[PDB]
Amino acid sequence: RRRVIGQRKILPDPKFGSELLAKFVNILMVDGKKSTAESIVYSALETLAQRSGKSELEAFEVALENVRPTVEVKSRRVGGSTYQVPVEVRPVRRNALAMRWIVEAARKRGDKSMALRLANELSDAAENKGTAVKKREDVHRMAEANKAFA
Amino acid sequence: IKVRENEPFDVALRRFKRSCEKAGVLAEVRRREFYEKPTTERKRAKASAVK
Amino acid sequence: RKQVSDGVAHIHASFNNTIVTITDRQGNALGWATAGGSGFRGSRKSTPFAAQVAAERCADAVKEYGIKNLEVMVKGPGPGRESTIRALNAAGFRITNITDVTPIPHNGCRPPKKRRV
RNA sequence: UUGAGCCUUGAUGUGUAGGAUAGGUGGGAGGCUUUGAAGUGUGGACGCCAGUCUGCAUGGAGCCGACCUUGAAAUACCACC
RNA sequence: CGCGGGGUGGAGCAGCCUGGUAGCUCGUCGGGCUCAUAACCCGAAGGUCGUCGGUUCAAAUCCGGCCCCCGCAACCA
RNA sequence: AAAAAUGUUCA
RNA sequence: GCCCGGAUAGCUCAGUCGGUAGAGCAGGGGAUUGAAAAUCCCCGUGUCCUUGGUUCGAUUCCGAGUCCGGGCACCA
RNA sequence: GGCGGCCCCCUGGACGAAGACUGACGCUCAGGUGCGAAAGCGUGGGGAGCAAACAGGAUUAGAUACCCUGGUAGUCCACGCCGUAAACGAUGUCGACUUGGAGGUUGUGCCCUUGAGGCGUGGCUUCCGGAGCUAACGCGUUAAGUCGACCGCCUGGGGAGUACGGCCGCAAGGUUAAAACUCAAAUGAAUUGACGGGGGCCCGCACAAGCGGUGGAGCAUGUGGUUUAAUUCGAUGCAACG
């Protein structure tokens, strides 16, 4: 526009010490409310803990920062001729976007509870059952093979 | 035009070929002719030298 | 096999295609490629990007003689002009050209009347 | 210049597994054929590129097949397809 | 008259050689877009299949009965 | 620099 | 009536000296969507016509059977 | 009007420079005569590319088009004809005069030539602009300024540069050139606003980027239509329809 517009910073999850975990409650926000959201977060977190005595946090991180978005098509003027310009994506916004997606992917896997979903779902890191693998085959398919420029 | 150079570079930046020299295209005498208004541009450039 | 060692490089960078051709010191055809064979749509087949890929597809076949040097002869306006160069340099082959041949006429025949649009 | 029928002299031989030189049957199992040392190292061959195939120098000293490995059998080697 | 072609949603046309199932294109119809509308956009409906009966489990469909319609000829002296 | 009409009479 | 060639996924067609039955296309399903599309993906279905035998797998090497197509006898 | 490679041959004009000569011998000009871009037409050749025409493909509702693929005559050459153009400086010709400024081009006189140069003076030619002229836009010493001589044409629009006829033309047509009837304007220039698929320039949930809705269903409620003795009345794109 003419100003970069954001808003206030949300607080890191205070009983596991982690901002990512708190931004994923927000993703699951139900009735407008964080409360009934945090339950299920924590329920499925434990599911993952049982199968994974080590960090079960690096099966979110790997999966989604393998996926590196880059494509859209715009246009701008250059030397008095406009040209249809392809535009790259900046590495920060790649991150920001990617964290959301996996957790968005739940409530459609046709289970009973968000337990059985987010548990079985999140555990994978590169063999995903979540939207992360399913966007790979479109992002790199497109790019630099049907994209004439950076 | 000839804008050749040796090594991996052999052309000149489009931008500086828009400065105190100009270059962007080169197919004048290989595309269709016109005569009335291509010569007026230069006359308007006599009003580019008015100050 | 034939131990070419300097392969004359034809390219015609047409707005509708980009051809790459490794020709002899006699100018005889050996190997070739285009973006259209590399395969995209039908109109991604000239783009600068498409033109880098194409120079490299070509390059792979004729390795078995061994080439090490180039005589780049650019030809035709139309894009992927320097997209091909970078592929070439980056491929075991070296610029030794100093002046290209493009054909430009003193002018005979009439070009089309073309689109009023 | 160049096809096709034979030979003669050369080259791969992948049935379940075995990476392949287990086409398939019979012959067939320890030390000289004066060459078989092996290895080191030069050259050519192959997606059997692993494996072997195949040139020459030192070595006339002695290879090494039960391979590796799988399998029901195991690969030396001589008919031979 | 006689040979031969055809009567199908409303229209222009398929399915009828070969008996079970009515489709296609067009309009019509509702609702949009638009300031309003063509254009455009989306979703419906709609045929005793020209009639009168014949055989059958089965008839727009096959064969006959009329009714126009349309077409090819109406032979030489 | 990505196709595209049309507006009954009267202050 | 013989002599050749053929029969593979919905469609259309490969192709193994005997490790395994695959492609291209249309369709559907998805990222899709100038409405709708056109652009981009992903598979799927098998005596590989029916019989058998070789066999540790064979359209995969092959007799036969049935069905089909070229070429030839063109036969009261 | 118009006229681009190179060389040759044949041939015109223009301009400046010094003198030398002629002795008003001159200027313009109805009619008339010659020249005329391009297309066309007639005769005869030639055929590369382009391309009327023409044939397909595409877009669109429709596409005798814009778009794409081809493509014939024609364009080219030799000969002849027809004679028009927004044939434009939209400015008749000739002559004489009237501020200036900068550029451009081309002759020629001169200056320690003492410079690559410095200063004159002629011919032609753009750009600027003064007075003045102009309705304004502007034009402005190469005038639309200020004068003269001579010609052409004009006298509201439509009807109409059509008809009729003559003339010219091979034709196509050209040239000359009306009238009946019909209208209250037609016309030029400039001014303001609005709008432009006009340009430049800048923002907003305008969009993008996100999230949650609606259209589906049932029910609540308004509204229209329809119906009824009445369904009282008004609201109507945003800017009427709990």
Write out the DSSP string of B6-44: SSS--S--TTTTSSSS--S---GGGS----SSTTTTTTT
Chain H footprint positions (protein CB, under 7 Å): 48-51, 66-68, 127, 202-207, 210-211
> Contact C4/C30 with Cβ under 8 angstroms?
yes
Q: Which residues of C touch A148 (CB under 8 A)?
A: 44, 47-50
Distance CA C78, CA A99 (A): 42
DSSP 3-state of B34? coil
Can you state the angle between helices A114-122 and A35-51, rounded to 10 degrees? 50
Pull the structure tokens for residue C51: 């033109």
Q: How far apart are CA C69 and CA C89, in angstroms?
A: 9
Tokens of A139: 């992002």
Residue C16 CB closer than 7 angstroms to strand H? no
Could you give the count of Cα atoms lying within 13 Å of C31 in the half-sphere of its Cβ? 17
Q: For strand C5-14 and strand C67-73, is the pairing parallel, antiparallel, or unpaired? A: parallel
Q: Are C71 and C93 in contact (CB under 8 A)?
A: no
C-alpha C34/C-alpha A82 separation (Å) is: 27
**C60 phi, psi to nearest 5 deg:** -60, -30
- Round and report the angstrom distance from CA (A57) to C1' (H168): 104
Three-state SS at A148? coil
State the structure-solving technique: cryo-EM
Nearest CA in chain C to A84: C47
B5 in Cβ contact with B11 (< 8 Å): yes
* Nearest beta carbon to residue C85 from set B8, B30, B32: B8
Closest nucleotide to the alpha carbon of A84, via C1':
F1
Q: A145 CB near a chain C CB, below 8 Å? A: yes
B30: which 2 tokens?
């290989």
Distance of alpha carbon A103 from alpha carbon A45, whole angstroms:
12
Angle at C105 between CA B37 and CA C72, to 5 degrees: 115
Q: By the 8 A CB rule, do C83 and C90 touch? A: no
CB of A63 within 8 A of CB of A131? no
**Which H or E run includes A121?**
helix A114-122
Q: For strand F, which nucleotides have at least one atom less than 7 Å from a protein CB?
A: 1-2
How far is residue C106's CA from residue C117's CA, in Å, rounded to a whole number? Answer: 28
Q: What is the resolution of this structure in A?
A: 6.7
Q: Identify the H or E element spanning A22.
A: helix A19-23
> How many Å lie between the alpha carbon of C59 and the closest alpha carbon of chain B?
18
Give the per-residue SS3 of A62-102.
HHHCCCCCCCCECCEEECCEEECCECCCCHHHHHHHHHHHH
Closest CA to C76 of C109, C97, C103, C52: C103
CA distance C91 to A76: 34
Take residue B21 and report the two structure tokens written for it: 């020299």
Phi, psi of A44 (to 5 degrees): -100, -25
Please tell me whether residue A24 adopts helix, strand or coil conformation.
coil
Contacts of B6 (CB under 8 A, 6+ apart): C95, C98
| Strand, coil or helix: A103 | helix
C30-C18-C28 Cα angle (round to 5): 20
